[PDB]
Amino acid sequence: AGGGVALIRVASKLADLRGQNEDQNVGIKVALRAMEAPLRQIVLNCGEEPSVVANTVKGGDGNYGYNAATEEYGNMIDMGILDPTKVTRSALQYAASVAGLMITTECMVTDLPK
Amino acid sequence: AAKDVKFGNDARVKMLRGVNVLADAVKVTLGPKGRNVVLDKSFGAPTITKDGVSVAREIELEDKFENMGAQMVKEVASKANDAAGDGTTTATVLAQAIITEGLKAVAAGMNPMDLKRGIDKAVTAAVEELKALSVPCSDSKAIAQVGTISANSDETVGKLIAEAMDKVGKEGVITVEDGTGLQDELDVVEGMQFDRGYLSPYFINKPETGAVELESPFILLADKKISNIREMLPVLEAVAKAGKPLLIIAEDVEGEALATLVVNTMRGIVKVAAVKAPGFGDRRKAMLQDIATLTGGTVISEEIGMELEKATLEDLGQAKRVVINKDTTTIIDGVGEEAAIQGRVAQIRQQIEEATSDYDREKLQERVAKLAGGVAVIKVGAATEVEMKEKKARVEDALHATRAAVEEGVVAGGGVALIRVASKLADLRGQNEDQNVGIKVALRAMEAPLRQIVLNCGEEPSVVANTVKGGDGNYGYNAATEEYGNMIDMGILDPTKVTRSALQYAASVAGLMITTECMVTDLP
Ligand SMILES: Nc1ncnc2c1ncn2[C@@H]1O[C@H](COP(=O)(O)OP(=O)(O)O)[C@@H](O)[C@H]1O
Ligand SMILES: Nc1ncnc2c1ncn2[C@@H]1O[C@H](COP(=O)(O)OP(=O)(O)O)[C@@H](O)[C@H]1O
Ligand SMILES: [K+]
Ligand SMILES: [Mg+2]
**In this structure, what CATH number is given to the domain that contains residue B396?**
3.30.260.10
Mutate to test the pocket of ligand 2, among B51, B76, B81, B90 (most ligand atoms within 8 A of CB): B90
Instruction: Give, for B156, the enclosing helix (H) or strand (E).
Output: helix B155-168
B89 and B30 in contact (C-beta within 8 Å)? yes
Asked whether B52 lines ligand 2 (CB < 6 A), one says yes
CA–CA separation, B199 vs B250, rounded Å? 11
Q: Which residue in chain B is spatially nearest to A53 when comparing CA positions?
A: B463
Check whether residue B379 and residue B357 sit in a common domain: no
Q: Which residues contact B446 (CB under 8 A, 6 or more apart)?
A: B94, B126, B418, B419, B421, B422, B503
- Residue B219, strand partner residues: B247, B317
Check whether residue B334 and residue B237 sit in a common domain: yes
**Closest Cα to residue B84, out of B360, B330, B304, B408?**
B408
What's the burial of B377, exposed, middle or buried (CB within 10 Å: 0-12/13-18/19+)?
Answer: middle
**Resolution value in angstroms:** 2.9
CA–CA separation, B508 vs B83, rounded Å? 14
User: Which residue CA neighbors atom 17 of ligand 2 most closely?
Assistant: B30
* Residues on chain B touching A55 (C-beta within 8 angstroms): 460, 463
CA–CA separation, B505 vs B84, rounded Å? 11
Alpha helices in B185-273 (DSSP H): 233-242, 255-267
Instruction: Give, for B79, the enclosing helix (H) or strand (E).
Output: helix B64-84
User: Which residue CA neighbors atom 21 of ligand 1 most closely?
Assistant: A87
Check whether residue B477 and residue B431 sit in a common domain: yes
- Ion ligand 3: protein residues whose beta carbon lies under 5 Å: B 29, 52, 89
The residue type at B319: A
Instruction: Give, for B275, the enclosing helix (H) or strand (E).
Output: strand B272-276
Q: What angle do CA B458, A26, B467 make, to 5 degrees?
A: 25
Last residue of a domain, one of B358, B384, B409: B409
Q: Which of A55, A56, A57, A58 to mutate to test the interface with B (most CBs of B within 10 A)?
A: A55
Asked whether B32 lines ligand 2 (CB < 6 A), one says yes
Residue A3 marked as a ligand binder = yes
**Closest Cα to residue B438, out of B92, B129, B125?**
B125
B87 and B109 in contact (C-beta within 8 Å)? no
CA–CA separation, B331 vs B342, rounded Å? 19
Going from the Cα of B442 to the center of ligand 4, the distance in angstroms, rounded, reads: 23
CA–CA separation, A3 vs A46, rounded Å? 12
A45 and A53 in contact (C-beta within 8 Å)? no
CA–CA separation, B373 vs B390, rounded Å? 30
CA–CA separation, B36 vs B34, rounded Å? 7
- Experiment used for this model: cryo-EM
B175: three-class secondary structure by DSSP = strand
CA distances from B262 to B207, B252, B313 (A): 16, 15, 22
Atom of ligand 2 nearest to the CA of B31: 12
Check whether residue B127 and residue B197 sit in a common domain: no
Check whether residue B436 and residue B452 sit in a common domain: yes
Asked whether A5 lines ligand 1 (CB < 6 A), one says no
- Residue B493, strand partner residues: B412
**Closest Cα to residue B479, out of B31, B19, B42?**
B31
Q: Which residue in chain A is spatially nearest to B460 when comparing CA positions?
A: A51
Check whether residue B262 and residue B290 sit in a common domain: yes
The shortest C-alpha distance from A33 to chain B (Å) reads 14
* 3-state percent helix, strand, coil for chain B, nearest multiple of 5: 55, 20, 30
Check whether residue B185 and residue B216 sit in a common domain: no
Asked whether B495 lines ligand 2 (CB < 6 A), one says no
**Closest Cα to residue B77, out of B99, B55, B60?**
B55
CA–CA separation, A49 vs A40, rounded Å? 8
Check whether residue B154 and residue B110 sit in a common domain: no
The residue type at B181: G
The residue type at B452: Q
Check whether residue B24 and residue B125 sit in a common domain: yes
B279 — phi, psi (to 5°)? Answer: 90, 175
Check whether residue B405 and residue B472 sit in a common domain: no
B94 and B506 in contact (C-beta within 8 Å)? yes
Q: Which residue in chain B is spatially nearest to A52 when comparing CA positions?
A: B463
* Residues on chain A touching B466 (C-beta within 8 angstroms): 52
Instruction: Give, for B252, the enclosing helix (H) or strand (E).
Output: strand B246-253
Instruction: Give, for B378, the enclosing helix (H) or strand (E).
Output: strand B374-380
Check whether residue B229 and residue B365 sit in a common domain: yes
CA–CA separation, B22 vs B15, rounded Å? 11
Check whether residue B336 and residue B213 sit in a common domain: yes
Asked whether A69 lines ligand 1 (CB < 6 A), one says yes
Domain limits for position B382: 135-190+372-409
How many CB atoms sit inside 10 A of residue B3's CB? 8
- Residue A86, strand partner residues: none
C-alpha Rg value of chain A to the nearest Å: 17
- Residue B177, strand partner residues: B379
A63 and A74 in contact (C-beta within 8 Å)? no
* Residues on chain B touching A52 (C-beta within 8 angstroms): 462-463, 466
DSSP state of B100: H
Residue B478 marked as a ligand binder = yes
CA–CA separation, B134 vs B131, rounded Å? 6
* Residues on chain A touching B460 (C-beta within 8 angstroms): 51, 55
CA–CA separation, B367 vs B390, rounded Å? 30
Asked whether B485 lines ligand 2 (CB < 6 A), one says no
Q: How many domains does chain B divide into?
A: 3
Residue A67 marked as a ligand binder = yes
Q: Residue B366's domain is classified under what CATH number?
A: 3.50.7.10
Residue B95 marked as a ligand binder = no
